[PDB]
PDB file of C-alpha atoms and ligand atoms in Angstrom:
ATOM      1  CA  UNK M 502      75.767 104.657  88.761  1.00 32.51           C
ATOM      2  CA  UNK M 503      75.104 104.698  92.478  1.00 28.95           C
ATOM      3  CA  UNK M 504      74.857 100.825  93.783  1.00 29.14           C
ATOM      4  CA  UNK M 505      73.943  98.434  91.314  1.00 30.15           C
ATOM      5  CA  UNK M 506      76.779  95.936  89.684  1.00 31.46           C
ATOM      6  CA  UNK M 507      79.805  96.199  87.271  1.00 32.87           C
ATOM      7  CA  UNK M 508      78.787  94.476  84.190  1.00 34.59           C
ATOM      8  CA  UNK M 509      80.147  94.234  80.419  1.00 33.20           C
ATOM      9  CA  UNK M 510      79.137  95.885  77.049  1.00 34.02           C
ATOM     10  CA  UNK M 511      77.450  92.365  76.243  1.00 38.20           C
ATOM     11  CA  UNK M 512      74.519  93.703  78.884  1.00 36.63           C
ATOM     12  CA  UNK M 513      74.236  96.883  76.971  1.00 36.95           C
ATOM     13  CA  UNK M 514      76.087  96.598  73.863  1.00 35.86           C
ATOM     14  CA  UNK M 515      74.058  99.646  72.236  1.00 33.54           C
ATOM     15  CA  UNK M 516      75.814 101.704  74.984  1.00 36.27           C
ATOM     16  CA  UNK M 517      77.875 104.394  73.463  1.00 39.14           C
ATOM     17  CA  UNK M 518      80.671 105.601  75.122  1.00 40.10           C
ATOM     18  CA  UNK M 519      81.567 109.309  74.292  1.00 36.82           C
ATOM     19  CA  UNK M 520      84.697 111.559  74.762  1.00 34.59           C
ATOM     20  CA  UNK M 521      85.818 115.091  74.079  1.00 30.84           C
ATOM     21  CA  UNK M 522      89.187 116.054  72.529  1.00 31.16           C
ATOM     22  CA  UNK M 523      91.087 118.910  74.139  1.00 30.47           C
ATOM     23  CA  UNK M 524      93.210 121.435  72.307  1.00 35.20           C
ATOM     24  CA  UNK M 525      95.727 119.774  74.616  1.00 37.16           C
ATOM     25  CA  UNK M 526      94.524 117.019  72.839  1.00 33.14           C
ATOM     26  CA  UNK M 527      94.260 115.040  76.381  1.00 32.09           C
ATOM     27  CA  UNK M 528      90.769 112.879  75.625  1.00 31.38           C
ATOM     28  CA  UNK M 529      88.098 113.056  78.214  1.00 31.58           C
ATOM     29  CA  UNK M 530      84.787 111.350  79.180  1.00 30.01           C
ATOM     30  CA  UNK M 531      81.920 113.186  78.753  1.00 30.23           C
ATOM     31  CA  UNK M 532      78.732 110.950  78.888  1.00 30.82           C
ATOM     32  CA  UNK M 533      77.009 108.016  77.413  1.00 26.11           C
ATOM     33  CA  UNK M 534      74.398 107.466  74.373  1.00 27.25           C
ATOM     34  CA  UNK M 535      72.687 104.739  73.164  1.00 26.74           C
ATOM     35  CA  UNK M 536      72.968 103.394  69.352  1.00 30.21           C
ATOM     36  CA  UNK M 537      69.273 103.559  67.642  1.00 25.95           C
ATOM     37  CA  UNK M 538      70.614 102.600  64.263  1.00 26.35           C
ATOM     38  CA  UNK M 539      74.056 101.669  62.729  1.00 22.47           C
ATOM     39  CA  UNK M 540      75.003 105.686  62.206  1.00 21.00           C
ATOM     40  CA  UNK M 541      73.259 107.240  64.845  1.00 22.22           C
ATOM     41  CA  UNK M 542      73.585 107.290  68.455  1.00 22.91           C
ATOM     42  CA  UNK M 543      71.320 109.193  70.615  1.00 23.38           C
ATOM     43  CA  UNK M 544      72.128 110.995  73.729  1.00 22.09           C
ATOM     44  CA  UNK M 545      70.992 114.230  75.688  1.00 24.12           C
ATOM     45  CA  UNK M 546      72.179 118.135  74.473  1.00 22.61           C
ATOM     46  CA  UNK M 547      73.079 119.633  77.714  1.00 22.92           C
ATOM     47  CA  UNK M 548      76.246 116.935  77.015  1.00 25.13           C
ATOM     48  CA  UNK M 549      77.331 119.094  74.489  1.00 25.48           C
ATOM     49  CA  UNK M 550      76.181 122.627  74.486  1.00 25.34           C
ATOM     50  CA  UNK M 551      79.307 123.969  75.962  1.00 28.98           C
ATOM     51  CA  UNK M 552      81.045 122.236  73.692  1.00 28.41           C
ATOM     52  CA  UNK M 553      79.037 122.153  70.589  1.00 29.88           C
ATOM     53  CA  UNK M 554      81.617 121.688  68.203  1.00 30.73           C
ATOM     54  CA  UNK M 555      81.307 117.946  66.162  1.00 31.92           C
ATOM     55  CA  UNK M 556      84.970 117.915  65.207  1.00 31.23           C
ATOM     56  CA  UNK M 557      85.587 117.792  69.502  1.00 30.98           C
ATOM     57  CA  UNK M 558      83.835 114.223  69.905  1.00 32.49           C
ATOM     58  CA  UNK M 559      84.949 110.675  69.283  1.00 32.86           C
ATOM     59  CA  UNK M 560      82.562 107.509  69.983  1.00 37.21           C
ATOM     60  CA  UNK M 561      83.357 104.546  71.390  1.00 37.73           C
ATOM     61  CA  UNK M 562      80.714 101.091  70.689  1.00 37.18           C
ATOM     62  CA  UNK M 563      81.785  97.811  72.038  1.00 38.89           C
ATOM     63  CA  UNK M 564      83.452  99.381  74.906  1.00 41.83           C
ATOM     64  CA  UNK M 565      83.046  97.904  78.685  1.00 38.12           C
ATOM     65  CA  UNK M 566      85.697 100.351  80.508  1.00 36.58           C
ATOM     66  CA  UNK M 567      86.917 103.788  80.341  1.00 36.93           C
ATOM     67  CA  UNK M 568      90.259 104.199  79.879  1.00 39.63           C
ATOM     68  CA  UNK M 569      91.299 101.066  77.888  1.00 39.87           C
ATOM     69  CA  UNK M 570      90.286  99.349  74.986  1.00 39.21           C
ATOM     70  CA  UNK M 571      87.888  96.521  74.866  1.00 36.12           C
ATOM     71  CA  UNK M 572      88.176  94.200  72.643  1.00 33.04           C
ATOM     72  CA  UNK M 573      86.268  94.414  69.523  1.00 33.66           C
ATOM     73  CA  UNK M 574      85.346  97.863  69.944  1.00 32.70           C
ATOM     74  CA  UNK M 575      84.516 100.654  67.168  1.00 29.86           C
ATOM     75  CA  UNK M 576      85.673 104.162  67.154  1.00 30.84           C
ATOM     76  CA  UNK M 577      83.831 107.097  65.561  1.00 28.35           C
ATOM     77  CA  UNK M 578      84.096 110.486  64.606  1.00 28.19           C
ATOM     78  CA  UNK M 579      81.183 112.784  64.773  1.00 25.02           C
ATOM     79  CA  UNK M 580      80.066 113.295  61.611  1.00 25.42           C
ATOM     80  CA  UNK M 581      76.810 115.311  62.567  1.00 24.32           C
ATOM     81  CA  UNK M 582      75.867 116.876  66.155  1.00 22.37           C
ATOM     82  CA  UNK M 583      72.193 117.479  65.979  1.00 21.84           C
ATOM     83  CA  UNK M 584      71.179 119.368  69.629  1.00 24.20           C
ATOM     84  CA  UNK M 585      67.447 120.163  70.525  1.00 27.17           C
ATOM     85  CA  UNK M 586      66.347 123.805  69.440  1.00 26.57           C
ATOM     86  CA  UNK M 587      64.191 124.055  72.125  1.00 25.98           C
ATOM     87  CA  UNK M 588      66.622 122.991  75.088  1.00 25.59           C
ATOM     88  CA  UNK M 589      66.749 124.693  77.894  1.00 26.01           C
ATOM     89  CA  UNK M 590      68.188 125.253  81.471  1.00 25.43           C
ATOM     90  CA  UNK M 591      66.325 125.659  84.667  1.00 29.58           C
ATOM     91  CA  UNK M 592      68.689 126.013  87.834  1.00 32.27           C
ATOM     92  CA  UNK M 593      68.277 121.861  87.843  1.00 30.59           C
ATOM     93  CA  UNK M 594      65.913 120.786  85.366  1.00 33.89           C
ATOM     94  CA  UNK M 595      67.135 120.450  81.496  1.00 31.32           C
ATOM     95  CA  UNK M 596      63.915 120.829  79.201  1.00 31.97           C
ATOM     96  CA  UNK M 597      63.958 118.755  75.605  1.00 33.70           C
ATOM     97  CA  UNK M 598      67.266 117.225  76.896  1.00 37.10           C
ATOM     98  CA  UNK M 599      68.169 115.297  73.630  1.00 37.36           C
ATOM     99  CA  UNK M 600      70.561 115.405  71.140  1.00 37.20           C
ATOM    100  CA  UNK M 601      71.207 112.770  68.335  1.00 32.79           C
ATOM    101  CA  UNK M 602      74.924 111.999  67.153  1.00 34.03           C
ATOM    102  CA  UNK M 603      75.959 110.732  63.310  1.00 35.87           C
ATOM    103  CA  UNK M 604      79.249 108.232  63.243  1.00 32.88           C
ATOM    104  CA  UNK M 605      81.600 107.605  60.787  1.00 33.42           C
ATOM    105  CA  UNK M 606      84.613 105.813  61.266  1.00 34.87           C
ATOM    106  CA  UNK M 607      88.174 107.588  60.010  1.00 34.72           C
ATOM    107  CA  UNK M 608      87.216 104.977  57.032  1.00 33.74           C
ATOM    108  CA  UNK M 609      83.810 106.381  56.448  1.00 33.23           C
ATOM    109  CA  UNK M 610      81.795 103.308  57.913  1.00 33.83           C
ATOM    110  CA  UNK M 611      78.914 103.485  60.952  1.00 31.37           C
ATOM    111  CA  UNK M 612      78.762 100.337  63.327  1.00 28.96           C
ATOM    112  CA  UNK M 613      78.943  96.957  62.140  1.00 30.22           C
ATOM    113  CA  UNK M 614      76.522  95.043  64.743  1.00 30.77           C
ATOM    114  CA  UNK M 615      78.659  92.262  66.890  1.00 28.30           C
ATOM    115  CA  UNK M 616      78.063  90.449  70.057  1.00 25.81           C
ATOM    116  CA  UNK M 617      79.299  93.400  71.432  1.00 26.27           C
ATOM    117  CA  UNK M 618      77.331  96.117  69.508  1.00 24.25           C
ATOM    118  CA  UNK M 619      73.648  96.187  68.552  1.00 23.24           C
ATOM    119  CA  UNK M 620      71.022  98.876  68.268  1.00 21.50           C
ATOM    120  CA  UNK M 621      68.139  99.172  70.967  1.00 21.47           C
ATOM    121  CA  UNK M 622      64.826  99.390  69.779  1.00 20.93           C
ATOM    122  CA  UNK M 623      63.068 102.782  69.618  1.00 17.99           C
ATOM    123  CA  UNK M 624      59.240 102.854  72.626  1.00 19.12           C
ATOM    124  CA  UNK M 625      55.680 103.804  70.166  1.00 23.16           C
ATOM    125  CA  UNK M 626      54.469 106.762  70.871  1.00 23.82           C
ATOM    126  CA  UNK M 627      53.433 107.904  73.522  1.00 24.59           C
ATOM    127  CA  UNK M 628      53.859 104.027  74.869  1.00 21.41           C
ATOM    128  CA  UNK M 629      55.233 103.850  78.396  1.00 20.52           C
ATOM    129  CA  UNK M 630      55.825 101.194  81.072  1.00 21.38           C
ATOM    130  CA  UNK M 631      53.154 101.389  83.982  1.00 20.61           C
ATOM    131  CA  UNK M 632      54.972 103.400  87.027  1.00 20.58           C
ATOM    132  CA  UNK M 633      56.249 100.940  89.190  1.00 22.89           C
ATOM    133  CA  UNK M 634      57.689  99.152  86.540  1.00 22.28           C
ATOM    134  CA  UNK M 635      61.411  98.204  86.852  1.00 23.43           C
ATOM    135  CA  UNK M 636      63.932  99.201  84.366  1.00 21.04           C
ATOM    136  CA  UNK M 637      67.520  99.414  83.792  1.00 21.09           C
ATOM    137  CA  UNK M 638      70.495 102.244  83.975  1.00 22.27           C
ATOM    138  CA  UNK M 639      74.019 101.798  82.878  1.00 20.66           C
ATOM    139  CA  UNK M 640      76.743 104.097  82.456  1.00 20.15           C
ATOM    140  CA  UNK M 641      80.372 105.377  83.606  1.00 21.50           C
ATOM    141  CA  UNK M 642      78.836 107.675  85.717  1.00 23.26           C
ATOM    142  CA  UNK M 643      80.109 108.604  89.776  1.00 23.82           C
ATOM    143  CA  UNK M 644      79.558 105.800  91.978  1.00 21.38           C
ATOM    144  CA  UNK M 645      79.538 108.154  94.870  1.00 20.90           C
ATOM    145  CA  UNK M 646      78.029 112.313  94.480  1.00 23.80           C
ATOM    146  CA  UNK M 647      81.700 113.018  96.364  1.00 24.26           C
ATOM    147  CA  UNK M 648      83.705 110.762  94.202  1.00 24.56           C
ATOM    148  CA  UNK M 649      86.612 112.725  92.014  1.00 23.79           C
ATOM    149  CA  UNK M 650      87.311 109.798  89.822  1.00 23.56           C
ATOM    150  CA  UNK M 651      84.645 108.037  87.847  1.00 21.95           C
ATOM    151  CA  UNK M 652      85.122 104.187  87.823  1.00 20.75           C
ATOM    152  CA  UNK M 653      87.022 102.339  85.282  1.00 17.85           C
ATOM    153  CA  UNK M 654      84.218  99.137  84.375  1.00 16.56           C
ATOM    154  CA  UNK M 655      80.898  99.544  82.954  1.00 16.24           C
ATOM    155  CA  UNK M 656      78.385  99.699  85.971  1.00 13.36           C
ATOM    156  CA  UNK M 657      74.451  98.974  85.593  1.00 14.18           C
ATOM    157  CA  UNK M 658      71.880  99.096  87.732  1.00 14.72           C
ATOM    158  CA  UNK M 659      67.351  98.523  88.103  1.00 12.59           C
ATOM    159  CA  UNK M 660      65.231 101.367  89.362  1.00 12.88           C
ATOM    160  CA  UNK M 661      61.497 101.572  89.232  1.00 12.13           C
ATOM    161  CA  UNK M 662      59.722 103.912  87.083  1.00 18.57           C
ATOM    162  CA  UNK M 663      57.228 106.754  89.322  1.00 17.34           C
ATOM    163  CA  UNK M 664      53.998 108.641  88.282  1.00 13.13           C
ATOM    164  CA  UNK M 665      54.077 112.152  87.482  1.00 13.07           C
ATOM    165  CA  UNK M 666      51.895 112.534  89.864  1.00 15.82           C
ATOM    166  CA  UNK M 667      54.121 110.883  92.480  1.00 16.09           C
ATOM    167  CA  UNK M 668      57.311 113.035  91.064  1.00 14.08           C
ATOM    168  CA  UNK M 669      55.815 116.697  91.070  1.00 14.01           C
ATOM    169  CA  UNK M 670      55.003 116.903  94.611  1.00 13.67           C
ATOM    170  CA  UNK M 671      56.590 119.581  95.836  1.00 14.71           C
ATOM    171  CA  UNK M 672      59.028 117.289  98.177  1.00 16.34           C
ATOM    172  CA  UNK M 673      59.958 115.657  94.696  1.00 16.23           C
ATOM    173  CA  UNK M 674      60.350 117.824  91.972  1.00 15.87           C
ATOM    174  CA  UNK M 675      57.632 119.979  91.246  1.00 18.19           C
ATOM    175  CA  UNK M 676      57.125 121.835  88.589  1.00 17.88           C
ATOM    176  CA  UNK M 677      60.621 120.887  87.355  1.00 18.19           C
ATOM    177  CA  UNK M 678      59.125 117.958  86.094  1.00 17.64           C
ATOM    178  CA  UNK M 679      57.015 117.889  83.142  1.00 18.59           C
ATOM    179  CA  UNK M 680      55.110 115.509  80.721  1.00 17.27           C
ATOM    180  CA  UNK M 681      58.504 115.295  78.274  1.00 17.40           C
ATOM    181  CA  UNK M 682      60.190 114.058  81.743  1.00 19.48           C
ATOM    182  CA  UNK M 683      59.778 110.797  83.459  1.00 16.41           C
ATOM    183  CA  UNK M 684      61.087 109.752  86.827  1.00 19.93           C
ATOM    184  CA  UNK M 685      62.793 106.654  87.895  1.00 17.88           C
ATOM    185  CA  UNK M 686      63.993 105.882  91.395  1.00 17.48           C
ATOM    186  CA  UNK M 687      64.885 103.087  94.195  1.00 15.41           C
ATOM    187  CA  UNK M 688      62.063 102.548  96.662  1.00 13.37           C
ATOM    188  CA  UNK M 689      65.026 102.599  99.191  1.00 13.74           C
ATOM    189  CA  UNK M 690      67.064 105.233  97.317  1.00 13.11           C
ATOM    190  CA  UNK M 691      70.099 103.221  97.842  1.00 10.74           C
ATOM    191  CA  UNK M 692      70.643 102.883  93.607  1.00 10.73           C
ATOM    192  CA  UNK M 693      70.511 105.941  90.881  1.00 12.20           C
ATOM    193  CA  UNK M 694      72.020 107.238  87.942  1.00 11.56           C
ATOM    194  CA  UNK M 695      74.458 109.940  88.518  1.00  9.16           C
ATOM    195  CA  UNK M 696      77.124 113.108  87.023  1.00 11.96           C
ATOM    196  CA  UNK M 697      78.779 110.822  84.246  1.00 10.34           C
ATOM    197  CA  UNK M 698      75.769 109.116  83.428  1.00  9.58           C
ATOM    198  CA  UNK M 699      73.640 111.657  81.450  1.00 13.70           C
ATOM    199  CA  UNK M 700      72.899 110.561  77.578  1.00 11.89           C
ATOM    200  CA  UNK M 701      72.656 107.283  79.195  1.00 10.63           C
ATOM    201  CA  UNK M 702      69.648 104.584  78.689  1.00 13.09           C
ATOM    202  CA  UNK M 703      66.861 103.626  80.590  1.00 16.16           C
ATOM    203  CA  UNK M 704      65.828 100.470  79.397  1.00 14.49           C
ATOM    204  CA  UNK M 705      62.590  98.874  79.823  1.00 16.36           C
ATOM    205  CA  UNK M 706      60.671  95.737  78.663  1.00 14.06           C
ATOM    206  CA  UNK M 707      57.649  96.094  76.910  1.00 10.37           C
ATOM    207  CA  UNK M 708      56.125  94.638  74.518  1.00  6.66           C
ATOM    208  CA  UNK M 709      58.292  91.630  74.293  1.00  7.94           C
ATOM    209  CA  UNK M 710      61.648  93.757  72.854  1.00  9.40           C
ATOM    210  CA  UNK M 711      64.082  96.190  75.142  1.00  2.30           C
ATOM    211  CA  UNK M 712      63.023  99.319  74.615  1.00  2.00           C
ATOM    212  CA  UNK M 713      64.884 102.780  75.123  1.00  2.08           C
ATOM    213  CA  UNK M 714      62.279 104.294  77.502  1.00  2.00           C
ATOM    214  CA  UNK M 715      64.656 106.740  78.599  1.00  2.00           C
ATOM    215  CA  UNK M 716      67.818 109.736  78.333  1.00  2.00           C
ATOM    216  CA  UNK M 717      69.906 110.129  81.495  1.00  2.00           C
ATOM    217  CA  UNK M 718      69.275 113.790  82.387  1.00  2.00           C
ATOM    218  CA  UNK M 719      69.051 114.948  85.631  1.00  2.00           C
ATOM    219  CA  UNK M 720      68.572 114.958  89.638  1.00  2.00           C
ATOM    220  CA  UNK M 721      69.244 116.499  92.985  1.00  2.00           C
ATOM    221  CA  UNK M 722      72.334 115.039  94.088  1.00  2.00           C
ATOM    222  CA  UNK M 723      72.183 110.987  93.275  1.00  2.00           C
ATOM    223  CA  UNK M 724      70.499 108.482  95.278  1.00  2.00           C
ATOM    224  CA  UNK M 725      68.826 110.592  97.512  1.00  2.00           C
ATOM    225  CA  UNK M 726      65.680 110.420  99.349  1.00  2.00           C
ATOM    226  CA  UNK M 727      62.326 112.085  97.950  1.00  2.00           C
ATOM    227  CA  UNK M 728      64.654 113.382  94.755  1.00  2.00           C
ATOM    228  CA  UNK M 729      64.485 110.236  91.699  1.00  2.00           C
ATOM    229  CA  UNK M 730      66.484 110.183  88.668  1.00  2.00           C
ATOM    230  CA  UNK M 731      64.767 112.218  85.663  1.00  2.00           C
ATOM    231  CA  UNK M 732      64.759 111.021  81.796  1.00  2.00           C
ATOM    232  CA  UNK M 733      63.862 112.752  78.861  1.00  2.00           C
ATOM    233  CA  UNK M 734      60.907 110.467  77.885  1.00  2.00           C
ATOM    234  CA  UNK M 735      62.047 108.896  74.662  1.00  2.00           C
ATOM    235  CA  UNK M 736      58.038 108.078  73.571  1.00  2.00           C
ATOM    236  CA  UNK M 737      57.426 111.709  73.650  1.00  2.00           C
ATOM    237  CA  UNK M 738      60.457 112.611  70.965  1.00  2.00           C
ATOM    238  CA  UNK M 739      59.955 109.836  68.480  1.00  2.00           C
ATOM    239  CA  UNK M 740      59.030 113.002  65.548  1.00  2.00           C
ATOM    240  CA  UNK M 741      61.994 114.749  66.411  1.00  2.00           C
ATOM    241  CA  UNK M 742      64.179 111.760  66.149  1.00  2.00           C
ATOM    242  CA  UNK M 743      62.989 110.884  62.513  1.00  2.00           C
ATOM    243  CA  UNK M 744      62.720 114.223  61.166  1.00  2.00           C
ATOM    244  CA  UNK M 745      66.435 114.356  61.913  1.00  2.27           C
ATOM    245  CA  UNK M 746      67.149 110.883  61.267  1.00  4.37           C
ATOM    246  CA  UNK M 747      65.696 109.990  57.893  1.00  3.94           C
TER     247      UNK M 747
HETATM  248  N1  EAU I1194      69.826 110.535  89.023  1.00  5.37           N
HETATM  249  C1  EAU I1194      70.183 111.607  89.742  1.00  5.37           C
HETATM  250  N2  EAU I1194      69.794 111.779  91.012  1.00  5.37           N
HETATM  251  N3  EAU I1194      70.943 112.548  89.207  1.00  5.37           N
HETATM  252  C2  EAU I1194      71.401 112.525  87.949  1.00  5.37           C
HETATM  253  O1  EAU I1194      70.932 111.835  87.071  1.00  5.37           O
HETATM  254  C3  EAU I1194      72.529 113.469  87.703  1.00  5.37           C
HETATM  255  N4  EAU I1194      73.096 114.003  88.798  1.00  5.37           N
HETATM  256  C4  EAU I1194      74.121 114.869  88.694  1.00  5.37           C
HETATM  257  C5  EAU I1194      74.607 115.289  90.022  1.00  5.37           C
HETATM  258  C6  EAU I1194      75.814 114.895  90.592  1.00  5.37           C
HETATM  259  C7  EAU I1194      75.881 115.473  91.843  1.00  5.37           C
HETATM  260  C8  EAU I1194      74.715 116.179  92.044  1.00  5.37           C
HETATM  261  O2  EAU I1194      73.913 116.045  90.922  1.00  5.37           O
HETATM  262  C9  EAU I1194      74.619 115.248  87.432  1.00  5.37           C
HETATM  263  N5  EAU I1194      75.666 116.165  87.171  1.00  5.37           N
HETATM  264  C10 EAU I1194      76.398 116.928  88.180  1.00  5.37           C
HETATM  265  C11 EAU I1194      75.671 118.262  88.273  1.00  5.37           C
HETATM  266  C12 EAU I1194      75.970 119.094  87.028  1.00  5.37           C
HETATM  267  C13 EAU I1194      74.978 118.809  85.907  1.00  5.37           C
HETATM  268  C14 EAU I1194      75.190 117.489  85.151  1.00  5.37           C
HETATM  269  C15 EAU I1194      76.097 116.451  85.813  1.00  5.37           C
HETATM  270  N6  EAU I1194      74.008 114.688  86.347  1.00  5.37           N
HETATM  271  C16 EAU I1194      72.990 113.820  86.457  1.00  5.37           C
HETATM  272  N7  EAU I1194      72.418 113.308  85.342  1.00  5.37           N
END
């Protein structure tokens, strides 16, 4: 997260923190998720396709930094990695960036919901904020594009959502962007998810209830001008998620 403010898992606490194992067996971050229900955590593929092997991942819930425990956290293994059939990659653009993620602890339990841990409600279909609207980002993610290290504490931060219209011109994204996409972005660019980030929520308000709007899944460069965060657009997936989810 470029900009915005350190905050706590209480802000977020269906954030999902997720790591890779190495054959070294050094443990890495590798991007966030978002808990939809007590055994699944949703997130985007291009997180994983590399890597596509379940037995590689371990889940953190509860947890507000990055390389030490929180308090009152819950670790997982992956128990299922379910990745979108129809991703793909474009030299930027990741198409039907989603992947879902079943966890069971070593002692076969999902999450037990705390004040720490809770699930985020799920948009309708098809059911989107009006552009303009603002929303919310949090992850691990760079706080700088030329950073090396990501930072330790939880960071969060409100962008606006943009038109389609608005985020295929040409000095936007053009064609990259599609219907399954949305855009979100500062009106003074100074604020933006970033590399880290991906898998990540987008939370917006509507109807009364948070709602995961969003997937973390790509940009050119972070926070920069004419070029806004893009999200899978959870409302446009909700099939997919229940077929594999039920
Ligand atoms: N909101 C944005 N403007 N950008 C992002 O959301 C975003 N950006 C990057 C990125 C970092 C530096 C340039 O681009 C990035 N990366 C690093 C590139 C390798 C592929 C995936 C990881 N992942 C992202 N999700």
């Amino acid at each position: 997260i470029i900009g915005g403010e350190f905050t706590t898992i209480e802000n977020q606490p269906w954030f999902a923190a997720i790591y890779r194992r190495h054959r070294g067996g050094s443990v890495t971050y590798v991007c966030g998720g978002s808990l939809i229900s007590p055994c699944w955590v949703i997130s985007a593929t291009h997180c994983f396709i590399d890597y596509p092997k379940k037995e590689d991942y371990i889940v953190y819930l509860g947890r507000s930094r990055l390389n030490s425990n929180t308090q009152g956290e819950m670790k997982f293994e992956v128990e299922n990695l379910i990745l979108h059939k129809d991703y793909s990659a474009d030299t930027l653009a990741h198409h039907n960036d989603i992947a879902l993620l079943k966890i069971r602890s070593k002692e076969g339990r999902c999450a037990q919901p705390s004040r720490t841990i809770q699930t985020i409600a799920l948009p309708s279909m098809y059911n989107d904020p009006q552009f303009g609207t603002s929303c919310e980002i949090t992850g691990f993610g760079k706080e700088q594009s030329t950073d090396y290290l990501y930072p330790e504490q939880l960071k969060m931060t409100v962008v606006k959502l943009i038109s389609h219209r608005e985020c295929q011109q040409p000095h936007y994204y053009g064609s990259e962007v599609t219907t399954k996409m949305l855009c979100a972005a500062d009106p003074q660019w100074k604020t933006d998810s970033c590399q880290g980030d991906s898998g990540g929520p987008l939370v917006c308000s509507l109807q009364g209830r948070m709602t995961l709007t969003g997937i973390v899944s790509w940009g050119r460069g972070c926070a920069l001008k004419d070029k806004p965060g893009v999200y899978t657009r959870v409302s446009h997936f909700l099939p997919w998620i229940r077929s594999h989810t039920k």
